[PDB]
Amino acid sequence: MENFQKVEKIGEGTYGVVYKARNKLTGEVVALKKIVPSTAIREISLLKELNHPNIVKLLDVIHTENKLYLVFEFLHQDLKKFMDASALTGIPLPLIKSYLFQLLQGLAFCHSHRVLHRDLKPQNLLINTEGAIKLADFGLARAFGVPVRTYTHEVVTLWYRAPEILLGCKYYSTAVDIWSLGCIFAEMVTRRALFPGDSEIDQLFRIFRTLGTPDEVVWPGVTSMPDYKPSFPKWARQDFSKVVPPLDEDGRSLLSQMLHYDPNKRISAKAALAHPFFQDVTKPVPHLRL
Numbered sequence: 462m463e464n465f466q467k468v469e470k471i472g473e474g475t476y477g478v479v480y481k482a483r484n485k486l487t488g489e490v491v492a493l494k495k496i497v498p499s500t501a502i503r504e505i506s507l508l509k510e511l512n513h514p515n516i517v518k519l520l521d522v523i524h525t526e527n528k529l530y531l532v533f534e535f536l537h538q539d540l541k542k543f544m545d546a547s548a549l550t551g552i553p554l555p556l557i558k559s560y561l562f563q564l565l566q567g568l569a570f571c572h573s574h575r576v577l578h579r580d581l582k583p584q585n586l587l588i589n590t591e592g593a594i595k596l597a598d599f600g601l602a603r604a605f606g607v608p609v610r611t612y613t614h615e616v617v618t619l620w621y622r623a624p625e626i627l628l629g630c631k632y633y634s635t636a637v638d639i640w641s642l643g644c645i646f647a648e649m650v651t652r653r654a655l656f657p658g659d660s661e662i663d664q665l666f667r668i669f670r671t672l673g674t675p676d677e678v679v680w681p682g683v684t685s686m687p688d689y690k691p692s693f694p695k696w697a698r699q700d701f702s703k704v705v706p707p708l709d710e711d712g713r714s715l716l717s718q719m720l721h722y723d724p725n726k727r728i729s730a731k732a733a734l735a736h737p738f739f740q741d742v743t744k745p746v747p748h749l750r751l
């Protein structure tokens with residue numbers, strides 16, 4: 462732990478704070494995360510074995526006196542920052558499609574190992590000059606528990622939270638990531654958050670206003686979920702034509718299958734990789750400003 466020289470503060474994770482750092486020994490640059498439950502130790506130590514082209518590699522795990530540090534391979538930018546940098550022009554579809562395609566490859570890999578991310582968002586998706594994008598903080602959710610805020614009690618967003626988690630489902634599945642990726646895909650395309658909810662119920666109602674209030678017809682058992690209230694307003698479903706303009710039909714159809722209410726109806730990452738939308742997918746390089 463004294464072999465790392467903090468250089469900057471990358472961000473404020475939900476579990477801990479992240480820093481760009483240099484290994485005083487190897488002299489390598491890395492992303493250092495500070496955060497104890499033994500069950501956790503084993504939990505994360507298993508994640509260190511996750512090796513995929515689209516998963517931010519977890520190099521080492523350091524537990525020292527009521528403290529836990531995670532060493533990750535360093536990447537130069539998070540998807541949020543990049544999107545902001547392209548607000549005026551917007552990311553070209555070829556690049557969007559490529560990112561989406563790689564992201565799903567990773568998700569497919571993690572899901573085939575029963576591992577879930579559970580808190581996907583622009584900030585934990587990292588990109589390099591090579592045109593590759595990667596998932597960061599995978600599995601950690603399970604390693605611990607999801608709080609409300611953080612140390613600065615600042616803001617961790619519900620914007621990408623799947624409906625099942627918002628309605629109280631205790632045992633959600635890998636389908637919650639697809640939904641999150643689903644919402645992120647939309648944001649890239651429109652350059653705006655699909656569901657920018659400022660509270661749980663507001664987050665739920667925005668989804669409703671756009672996808673329509675769910676029922677037993679589209680979502681069997683929905684009315685029996687922990688937080689379902691028969692008193693929920695009933696809104697109609699709006700057509701994606703107005704949701705993701707100007708996205709082509711292939712992407713819109715692919716998107717609607719990522720945004721299905723019934724988790725068992727929501728498309729899997731593996732199946733999504735087979736969708737027509739990726740018929741002409743390529744790997745363009747981004748214009749990154751560092």
Ligand SMILES: Cc1nc(C)c(-c2ccnc(Nc3cccc(O)c3)n2)s1
Binds near residue numbers: 474479
């Ligand atoms: C949140 C995050 N959690 C982890 C583990 C992150 C991580 C991992 C590897 N590399 C980076 N780099 C990075 C670089 C510029 C801006 C940024 O938000 C993140 N961040 S970001």
